[PDB]
Paper text:
Further classification and multibody refinement improved the resolution of the stable U1 snRNP region and adjacent U2 5′ region to 4.1 Å and 8.3 Å, respectively. The U1 snRNP structure in the pre-A complex is highly similar to that observed in the yeast E, A and pre-B complexes, indicating that U1 does not undergo substantial remodelling during early spliceosome assembly. As in the aforementioned complexes, base pairing between the 5′-splice site and the U1 snRNA is also stabilized by Yhc1 and Luc7 in the pre-A complex. A prerequisite for U1 movement is the dissociation of Prp40 from Rse1, and thus the apparent dissolution of U1–U2 bridge 1.
Here, by deleting the branch-site adenosine (BS-A) or mutating the branch-site sequence of an actin pre-mRNA, we stall the assembly of spliceosomes in extracts from the yeast Saccharomyces cerevisiae directly before the A complex is formed. We then determine the three-dimensional structure of this newly identified assembly intermediate by cryo-electron microscopy. Thus, Prp5 proofreads the branch site indirectly, hindering spliceosome assembly if branch-site mutations prevent the remodelling of Hsh155HEAT.
Numbering used by the authors:
A (entry chain C): 3 to 197
B (entry chain i): 8 to 80, 83 to 108
C (entry chain H): 4 to 19, 38 to 140, 172 to 244
D (entry chain d): 3 to 95
E (entry chain h): 1 to 49, 58 to 73, 78 to 119
F (entry chain b): 2 to 63, 73 to 131
The structure:
Amino acid sequence: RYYCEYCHSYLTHDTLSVRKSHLVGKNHLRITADYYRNKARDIINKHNHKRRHIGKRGRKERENSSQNETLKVTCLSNKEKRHIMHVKKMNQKELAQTSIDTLKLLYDGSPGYSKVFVDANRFDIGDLVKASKLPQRANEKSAHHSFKQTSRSRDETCESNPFPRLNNPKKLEPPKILSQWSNTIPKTSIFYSVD
Amino acid sequence: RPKHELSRAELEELEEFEFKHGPMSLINDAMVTRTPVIISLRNNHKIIARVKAFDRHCNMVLENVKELWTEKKNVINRERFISKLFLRGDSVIVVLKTP
Amino acid sequence: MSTPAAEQRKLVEQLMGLHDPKICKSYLVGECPYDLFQGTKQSLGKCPQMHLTKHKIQYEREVKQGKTFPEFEREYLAILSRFVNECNGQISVALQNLKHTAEERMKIQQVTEELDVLDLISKRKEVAKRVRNITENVGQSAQQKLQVCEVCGAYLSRLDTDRRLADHFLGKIHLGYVKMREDYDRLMKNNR
Amino acid sequence: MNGIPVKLLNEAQGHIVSLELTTGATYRGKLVESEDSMNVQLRDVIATEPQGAVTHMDQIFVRGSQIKFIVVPDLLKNAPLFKKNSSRPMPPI
Amino acid sequence: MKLVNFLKKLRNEQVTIELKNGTTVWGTLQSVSPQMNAILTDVKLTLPQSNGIAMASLYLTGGQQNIASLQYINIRGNTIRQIILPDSLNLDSLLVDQKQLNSLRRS
Amino acid sequence: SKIQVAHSSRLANLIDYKLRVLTQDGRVYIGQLMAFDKHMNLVLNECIEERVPKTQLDKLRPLNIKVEKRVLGLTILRGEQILSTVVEDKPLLSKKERLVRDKKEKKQAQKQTKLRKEKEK
RNA sequence: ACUUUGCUCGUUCCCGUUAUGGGAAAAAUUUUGGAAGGUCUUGGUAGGAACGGGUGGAUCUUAUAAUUUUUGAUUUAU
RNA sequence: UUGGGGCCCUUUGUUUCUUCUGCCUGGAGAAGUUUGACACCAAAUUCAAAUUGGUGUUAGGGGAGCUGGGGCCUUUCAAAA
RNA sequence: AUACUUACCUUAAGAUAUCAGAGGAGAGUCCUACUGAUCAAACAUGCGCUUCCAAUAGUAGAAGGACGUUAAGCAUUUAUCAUUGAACUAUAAUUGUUCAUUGAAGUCAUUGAUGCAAACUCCUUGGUCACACACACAUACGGCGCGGAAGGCGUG
RNA sequence: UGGUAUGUUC
């Protein structure tokens, strides 16, 4: 007999063909991915604080510290700290999910763009891309998307697209700035830019 | 005959029958006639001792053990008298019985 | 078994004239139908005749250079013809069940009520009523939308994509039955 | 029957693991499909021989008795196989 | 007729164990698995007169400061070469083989 | 190391202890066990593998010994090529805190079974 | 050992009498076990008992002393 | 109830049982608590919103009542000198 | 979520501590809210028991490390073979010396590897606890405070 | 006498 600890589903006598097919089906994938995400979120979010050790402080430290100054404590209400911590959590997860993708879109017209950056004609890890296609045995998963594939083959040479400026490129993205410190940008530019 | 299809809980009788009338005739003769045997082991530890018990794994209890080995550098023989010993059948190369 | 040594001992004991009823002739020629449906839902149980690998190797060595036996081939042809007749009867029963499901009482009553109201401007109204009746018939047929497999006699689907169909064709039942159809067609081409 | 460690080895399928062999050669790659007998198959394999050199295999398959150990990723630190008092929701008859 | 049940009757016995690596282990027995995975406490272990692998295995167990004194050691079955029992114990009473006596009475 | 390992404990009782397990080579693995089996296959959390070099072995033969430590993290070690296991360091939380944690796990598991019985109805 | 007759010493009380006997308790006191009360300290306070399993997980035996751990090719020697 | 003095506030979401209001001229107020409630993750339904699958929490200290056990003292019964 | 099709499979067994005695069931076996003894588990409980628990009358320090710095620190050791050409020491598949054509793989590492040794900095842990800044001891030390962590022994 | 996974309609 076999029991899945993730899906909480039982099974018959332990056949490798059934157990292999169980770890491919979509319900086990959803339950396993959600369980790993929640356990990682719990071990990040668990603030294991140190146990405090307070000793009887010295006399001259008390005459020095109680005479210098008294600082002001800031504090906020419940909805304010809840909204601020929710914005900080979405900022932490969008920084953990993002990555710099300037070299992919900056060498887009390079003659070896179809041999390294296409990520399907790659030599060492291209067989891993060509192996598991997620073959979409549902007809709705193949009939949902109606856009182009734009699969760049390896055999694209330098004869195609000879002049990269006549074929309309994209203007590069500006360096993004922090929205909390966006009020200190120089409002006057150096040169006159139109449109 | 296959081992799994013989019977249930009667394999001990066949094991005793193989003990009485098989390759175990020398370990049986040494424990009933208290004769000393010489067991050569896989690390040159030759044991002269009397057999006290028999096991399926050839795990043997030995009494009045006189063991001897040889250090080769130069050539010396080092011996030791051990009263009680429980020897594993993994280490046993061979068992010789004297008449 | 729990140990692989007993499995290897079983393989040795089942691996080590020739015209005897104990030897399965359908397995002696090859691809016994009691072997191709061992553990599936269409299982016949257990073959009463014994199967052996040494006799199969001797038959392969004899059919390579020595000779051939037409009696075992005729017995395998008769067994394949009986199994093909049973599968054709099952496929005819499935086709009759599909025809009975397409001709149910309430479905034919609804179709007759739609066609009774189906009767330039009158031709356009009749074409719109015929299109509405065709849409109602498509909605009635889409409640099951189960076709009939032309070879193995199972159920298929038209709106289903080719990947799930290719997963359907790679089974023990379909591979065994296509092999039995190939053997039956080869024996009918050799006999006729 | 099987036990917790072989279930943990079957748990981390499709992840970057690192084996060490009994000879001293350390493999590292993505686990294709583990088995109950620990005869494990790896892909994008980088290998270090006991002599010291580093090479790269595409698709390796090592037998379970010639394995010193294997390193699973750290997110399997928290697994339901490690739970001691996990009850069982009504096994079938 | 496995003699591991003979060692299961040897709790709180102050024995020595020579391993296949060559280490002599002096300590009291606490428990032993039926697969002969024996646990010991109040242990000192010594590699006599060499094997550098055995010297590494002797030192890298904590508590060296070549007699190494350790509090608790579990020993696997296939690493046990031989075990020496104290001579004061009576082997005629501990090898009664009550399971073998019940098997003989069941015959 | 004044730990005073338990006098009548076995592998079910030694769980979550910082073991110092010895192998046939002497490649000592230090880490917390979290599971075992009949073949004594041990998973090891935050594990480190320490060895001694061949040049240090001459100094070790009859002081400071420079061991080579590599970090394995969470590994799973087989029971074939191991020799002996000891208990090196005690865990963080105590026996009473593990008892309260086990009671909380039992109450949470009973609540989960009540939730499965409520969802089944 | 029972039994009787008198002497002597003697725990406590009475009487013939403060020599000494007679009668009674055959006692005051020490220990163990059981019943009750008071005081000091600690844990628990919402589940528990019985039965039923083509129940789940652990432990033992045999398959299993033969290539997958656990019944050995890891003391590097001819 | 007020006032003074000493320490702590890392409780870093300013008590972390939860929700809401709210705080350093202060340390608070209201509600609820195991077939329930709270917070979060993932998704297709083309904002938000709603649905489904899971994860984690429901705490700490003191007091009245009941009960189990350990030690001392007192009363009574049975047995042995 | 209901209804249907398809792909795979449909189960190694026996038992739940041991010994002695009495009774019952047609030499052997089973049962006793049957009796004595040993052992195991759980919950309490005590042993002038065993080990540990970090200054604040200061700006420290105990344990484990740095996969940290000085540090390319100091002292040593290696960084391919074969055929031939112009000389050649020469028992080798010209090994040795200088230069080159060609032939098979060809770890990176020489700021590399091993040994030695000091200093600085930073991480995880604690009772950073209650009274006092005190004249005890050959039977060597009044272990006769509130606890916590690990363990031994004993009782119910 | 059943289980796991997948694809359509409400």
